[PDB]
């Protein structure tokens with residue numbers, strides 16, 4: 001049981017009543033546009049609103065200048081038209097600042113504050129919850145889980161040293177990153193181990209490659225496989241699940257929650 | 263790891279390589295017919311064949327005379343046109359004899375050999391695998407799991423005393439029987455406990471009521487909820503899952519199997 005809530009500015013996410021669903025926003029860049037066109041932002045608001053209606057609790061919105069021209073226009077519209085906390089999917093320090101300014105409540109660094117250490121400071125400054133996902137430029141592990149926890153801890157070191165509060169820290173195993181198909185199945189089977197570090201954990205496996213490797217199905221045929229990873233993750237104690245199929249995953253999460261007793 | 267295979271006459275089911283999917287056959291009685299009409303049996307063969315193509319490993323086919331007039335005609339067609347072991351879903355001794363005669367390889371007693379003790383003898387005789395599901399005429403438990411295991415053991419007593427071989431015994435928790443919505447969620451959260459009795463376990467929760475009670479959805483909207491129960495069950499060590507949505511549940515079972523390492 002957590003003795004605190006995830007404080008996200010206007011909104012507050014409770015980590016005990018249920019598994020929090022983070023829906024991946026569908027960004028489809030408009031040609032002839034640096035970012036901001038009616039088509040792009042509108043299609044984005046329709047999705048945000050849609051996911052919001054089918055169970056989402058968070059909306060994850062994903063050069064350095066281009067990235068800002070594209071993401072800012074959406075964080076502005078979505079935050080205004082959809083009453084839900086927004087997280088910015090990036091590792092770059094600048095993009096993270098801009099995004100929180102436009103309205104983003106959470107940071108989502110796929111490189112755990114290691115590719116641009118300054119982003120940890122951006123997070124500490126604005127005092128927003130940050131997601132440190134496991135990642136590395138190689139897949140040569142002595143002991144997968146042992147090294148994952150070691151790498152994660154080093155992201156936590158960079159985060160805390162930057163002034164990040166323990167309560168504004170969330171971990172992610174990094175399923176699908178610097179891991180072979182078999183190594184991903186190993187992380188899944190051992191996810192509970194991350195819990196020893198004492199922080200909430202977010203699981204991102206939606207429609208990923210290792211599900212295709214196992215079921216041998218294309219990307220648009222990985223719904224039942226995503227579900228399985230989600231159920232096993234909730235059962236191993238995950239607080240959040242980052243998915244595409246918000247409607248389907250919400251029911252599975254909810255039914256899971258009832259059974260485990262969350 | 264099991265040190266033996268489920269011997270079903272012509273076919274042999276291995277309990278270690280994967281979770282065995284038992285598909286529920288769609289029996290829709292034909293009016294003006296005691297049983298056997300072309301419509302009934304044909305529609306039944308189409309389903310059996312369909313499930314067979316989407317992952318099933320077993321086909322479960324469900325007065326005393328009527329029951330025989332209806333079930334025998336199908337076990338005959340299905341067994342002949344579909345190369346897969348067939349199980350007869352009944353508790354009555356006579357129906358069980360007839361069914362195995364027509365071609366049924368497994369018995370599926372929803373009353374664990376307690377409503378008609380003679381069925382255990384039918385099973386011992388023909389030497390076929392039998393499924394003892396938990397059930398009772400009341401829901402007044404002192405300790406749910408403790409009493410479930412106690413009741414199950416009494417079905418095992420009736421079975422073994424009848425001459426049934428330990429290797430031809432399969433247990434089922436009886437989700438949805440003599441259990442309140444909350445009690446079903448309790449059985450699910452504690453399923454691993456059944457494993458202490460030393461027998462393979464079959465889980466039947468497909469589209470059941472407690473999933474509607476939790477998700478608050480009608481029967482045709484319980485696919486994501488069935489999946490969750492299936493994934494948690496496989497994770498708690500189930501060898502078989504009795505489902506309606508064979509295509510969907512097979513992928514989830516398969517992905518589960520990869521992750522847990524079955």
Ligand SMILES: Nc1nc2[nH]nc(CC(=O)O)c(=O)c2c(=O)[nH]1
Nearest residue numbers: 089108110131133172175204205
């Ligand atoms: N925290 C987190 N962020 C991500 N951002 N982008 C991706 C790329 C993607 O959508 O496949 C991802 O997988 C994850 C993840 O698993 N976890």
Ligand SMILES: Nc1nc2[nH]nc(CC(=O)O)c(=O)c2c(=O)[nH]1
Nearest residue numbers: 351370372393395434437466467
């Ligand atoms: N073994 C077993 N047999 C059944 N037969 N019929 C039913 C009725 C049904 O299809 O809902 C059932 O739930 C089960 C079960 O859970 N388990």
